[PDB]
Design a protein around this ligand. Structure first.
Ligand code: UTP
Ligand code: UTP
Ligand code: UTP
Ligand code: UTP
Ligand code: UDP
Ligand code: UDP
Ligand code: UDP
Ligand code: UDP
Lengths: 228, 230, 222, 216, 227, 226
């Protein structure tokens, strides 16, 4: 039972708390939760999203170029990354932040072999700037990094308990292909492909209800498990 | 009578519109008013603030560490820089962005000799990431950059007409000495920004940027706003 | 006709159906890229690397895929430096950016600079794919095309088009099941409406005729 | 016997006779490294890349750019070795003379020694980091910088059982590239030419047994 | 009492020994003194001044451009930084030099997260090139580098015992009181940066053998500025 | 003669001129002599040493690691280079500082194809830096790479004497210096020129108006040519 190495995707919702900017009362709750599961010995890499600031396709619909707006939005997710790092630090947790856009003064660059040893060294690894590339999502970054750093599962942390059938019975266990056949919102379509095609399982759970991610990695039947 | 090269300081309210985030109505209007001055033949670099995302000092008081919160603030500065770049592109203006924190993929690093040479080429240089270091401000950034690139004056763009003896609810000042600002307690900039310009004789001009046509006035030498000098 | 183009070169176009480098192939490629820079087209090109290793074929031989994807990606810099040399001997100015930073071998990926190079009449070569495992070169050419703001993706093959449909909608190739490029890359093209033109490069003057706007190959367009 | 060894592997040791990569050859090359590691000797490996060429110097490429492609090819050989070692249960550390970060650790010699002392096998890819250098010279140089006891020139061929640096130069015997050989003869490194591919012959070699040809 | 992580300002006086250029006797003495406090267990980062070569404002007075002169003067600090690295290495002390103006192969760029990690590994971080920007001092660079790397105090290493009142050496002043008495501690702008963030400043005679380990243990030597 | 593009080599100890450090009174006149040349119409590239920021055999004896000791010298050349850039600009001369080690913020990297592009545009280019080589050698190599017609070794003696402690010789051949044992430049520097035909002109720099006579093709100093 259990997952030894996980990749946790935090949306911008987990930083802004719904609205724009930063909600310290959420990042605190967010950090107390990660810390509870690191003390259990799980190696946990965190991929940071950035919708509490900008989203590239949102700003392009307004008139801004998309490329320039995708960089704008990856830069927001570094700001979340520095903020998760501070709150995890007040929790006693050692952090290592890695950005896909290299910014030496601010974080070490993307080096996957070192990111894997940080974990083994018991450090929490924070991937910022997503994948570094415009026309991609942080959902897809979580799929990508999770496959490269040898994660056992991608933990899609949400503010509701799992995947329902419309917005309504919540279903606990589904095939990857079962999700697409029932037209379900599990992640990016692009992200889901990279996972399904490579057999990477995904767990959609309510990270904010107390002590749920620790339940998750112990193997308990928590949330929704997408597995092939 | 006339400034040849200028350094304009845009606070975060020129991107957030008073509020946290990005109000595209304001950058569009600021981008419109910069293009008007570029076609007039002024060389203009732009130091960009980030009040509309994070200030390190206020997050420090919420409990966050100052240095991490200051980096968050400088990262927000490049987000405003890229946004000014976009709107300034839609006005048909050629821009080079430079980040004090080095980010090859996003913008060329801070190289000051190339900066003044883009200006000579007719381009607008946008100075992102502040000074690249915590425990500083973009007001002080403007003071330093203006000095390093040989700007004739620091343009402190505000949304009011200038400095007034006493807040609001009426008496505006046209021309002040540097020591006049100090002896009277007027707020023109950071204590450090101002000291950096006063000690090196850089003039500061505080003016209402948002009234259509006014920056282009200020640069042609018009007696607009508030000029602190000598 | 097209102002900025992103041409995708597979390991076919360096190794030639065998393994390694067949310099008669590479030289003809350079010969044809040469033709279009004289034409006034801004061309950036993405280099694939199946004449050495493919990450998913080595993964089936036994090897770990991550480690093998990097092997594949270095393969493309070898192909990338090869094109550089021959295009130079055709008299063309090149500049090679790698998605995996190597400093001394080539400049890193600076996309705003890749585009000032095009504007200056130079040919930008995009090596090391996207610099990430679990991706293909076809996906790279879509991403790189949208980022440098190219008008169309030239999918260079050695057959002339796909089968010979001369113009097809983005949704019509999903509905008939024709093959144009990787499914991950095509969907990133369809979803952003980036056109893809599949054409025989190896016939003389074909690509020069493609950027000219001529009915050539198979054009996928919504 | 020998305590620390530098092993030079030609392109031949990766593609076999022909071009590209041969899993059989690489697998038996690693099987041989493994029972050596297990034997207690610290072993660092310099990797060549002749399996990615033929015609190279008949196309006219430059040598600067040419030499860099070869150097890139050695890093593909290193990653490949590292994989087949890993399946044999051997911990490795690939270093490159050309900084790459994302692919591999840079070349620091102090930190390579650290790795050997910690029981890991160091693979040196990208050669010397510069054009106009061979691999025989990278081997001669890195054997020196990490303090190896001997350079092991792994050939595919099996008779002189001992010559010396001052003895060979009188005969038409090429044991390695003349720039590499002139570095070893000048600094007192021995050179052992042997058949790596006869089963368990490198284990006998570092034990001190009469194998192949030793140059002192 | 004692300081657990410290930042040490060495002016040009501490390499040129007074005259211009470099004086190995002075530098050796300075490395001896740093080395024996690193074994004490102190994490120590050093900011290197440059008056034994160039000072921006002084070349400015001779006609030269300030901006260019400031850069001249910054490269002077790297020259000193390499000397201090050298003498400390010959004392068997692991050093790491980070330079504000990045040169790559001469030293590593400014990476502050990694500077505190060097200190935690027991290494001596040397801060060359000041802050990298014209129109600043290395006194301000120490005040800045000390706040960001988290140091407990700034050690203004002088050749005199401490801050005087023109005899009369002062053992402990408050920040506000230095400005009110017009005492000369550091820079004007360097002191403000310190005063405004509550960063203490100990001014002491580094040259008298054993004074810095003395200072670090928390003994009352020199002049301590605190609020 | 009539030299159209020249590589001027100055020993660093010239700028410190009398002591250690920098004597602005000397680099000032060096700048204004170089201006007369370019406003005359000659293209001029400059290499400067570092010997003024050290006391003679300072770090030869100090025990310093030679790689680190060399980097200290390269930094001093750049300090010397910026100081020249400044007075040459007050002389009204566009200048460009190129550094062998990339120092983006301080100057521009070394690209020789761009370096002649500067001289063609009436600008002076200044070469800093160059481990384990002397600035004599770098002057030899820059001069070759930028197509210079001649390497002007500006030294503090009138030329090359036959005996040394005589008569200063005015014209020698490349094979003649190696054979007679004459002090022209570093051995590696000299072999770089003699193996590539590159002529070398040794002349005293402290006497004013001499740089101008070198380029003009006055028969001054010692001309070494094969
Ligand atoms: O490291 C870098 C350097 C530059 N850039 C960005 O690339 C763009 C082109 O920068 P370039 O250096 O390629 O040319 P230039 O237009 O700036 O100047 P000149 O050719 O006239 O000499 C500029 O917008 C720059 O900000 C990066 O994104 N990263
Ligand atoms: O990386 C660099 C490159 C260049 N520079 C410095 O910036 C200044 C101008 O930078 P540029 O390279 O863009 O123009 P240029 O004067 O050299 O020549 P043209 O393109 O107009 O033909 C030059 O003085 C150069 O030394 C840097 O400081 N850092
Ligand atoms: O820049 C780098 C440095 C290191 N690495 C790679 O990261 C992996 C481990 O990275 P580390 O350097 O952090 O740990 P280590 O196991 O190799 O050494 P110690 O903990 O004992 O001190 C190694 O396989 C290395 O090659 C990179 O990929 N890039
Ligand atoms: O380029 C860089 C490299 C590193 N760092 C940051 O410096 C800090 C020090 O990270 P280090 O690489 O210096 O050592 P470490 O913490 O990983 O400890 P060991 O593996 O050796 O056991 C890290 O937190 C990193 O994010 C940067 O800011 N920029
Ligand atoms: O590889 C990446 C990662 C992020 N982004 C941009 O940065 C934004 C960050 O938001 P994100 O979409 O990642 O996710 P969310 O915050 O909703 O989880 C994206 O939306 C894109 O606009 C991008 O362009 N490429
Ligand atoms: O050199 C600099 C420039 C800016 N900042 C950061 O910039 C943030 C906000 O900028 P600023 O206060 O200037 O914004 P404005 O109010 O002018 O919009 C602060 O919290 C600082 O951390 C910094 O730390 N160093
Ligand atoms: O972003 C990239 C680009 C390439 N590759 C690897 O490099 C190989 C290059 O193969 P590709 O399909 O691109 O080459 P082609 O057949 O088009 O020549 C891929 O298969 C992967 O193994 C990768 O992992 N990521
Ligand atoms: O951030 C910095 C650091 C140094 N300097 C320049 O380098 C000189 C070094 O002076 P410093 O006071 O630091 O040396 P000290 O006097 O302390 O010996 C300064 O005067 C400036 O000319 C600078 O401009 N910015």
């Amino acid at each position: 039972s259990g997952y030894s190495r996980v990749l946790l995707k935090l949306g911008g919702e987990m930083f802004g708390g719904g609205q724009v900017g930063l909600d310290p009362d959420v990042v605190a709750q967010v950090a107390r939760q990660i810390a509870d599961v690191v003390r259990g010995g799980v190696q946990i890499a965190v991929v940071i999203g950035g919708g509490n600031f900008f989203r590239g396709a949102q700003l392009q619909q307004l008139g801004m170029e998309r490329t320039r707006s995708d960089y704008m939005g990856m830069l927001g997710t570094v700001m979340n990354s520095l903020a998760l790092q501070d709150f995890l630090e007040k929790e006693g947790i050692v952090t290592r932040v890695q950005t896909a856009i290299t910014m030496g003064q601010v974080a070490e660059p993307y080096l996957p072999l070192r990111a894997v040893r940080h974990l083994e060294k018991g450090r929490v690894v924070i991937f910022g700037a997503g994948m570094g590339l415009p026309y991609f999502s942080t959902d897809t970054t979580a799929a990508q990094r999770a496959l490269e750093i040898g994660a056992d599962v991608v933990l899609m942390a949400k503010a509701v308990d799992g995947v329902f059938a419309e917005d309504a019975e919540l279903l606990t266990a589904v095939s990857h292909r079962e999700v697409l056949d029932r037209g379900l919102r599990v992640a990016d379509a692009t992200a889901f492909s990279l996972c399904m095609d490579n057999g990477m399982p995904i767990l959609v759970f309510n990270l904010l209800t107390d002590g749920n991610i620790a339940r998750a990695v112990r193997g308990e039947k928590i949330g929704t498990l997408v597995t092939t």
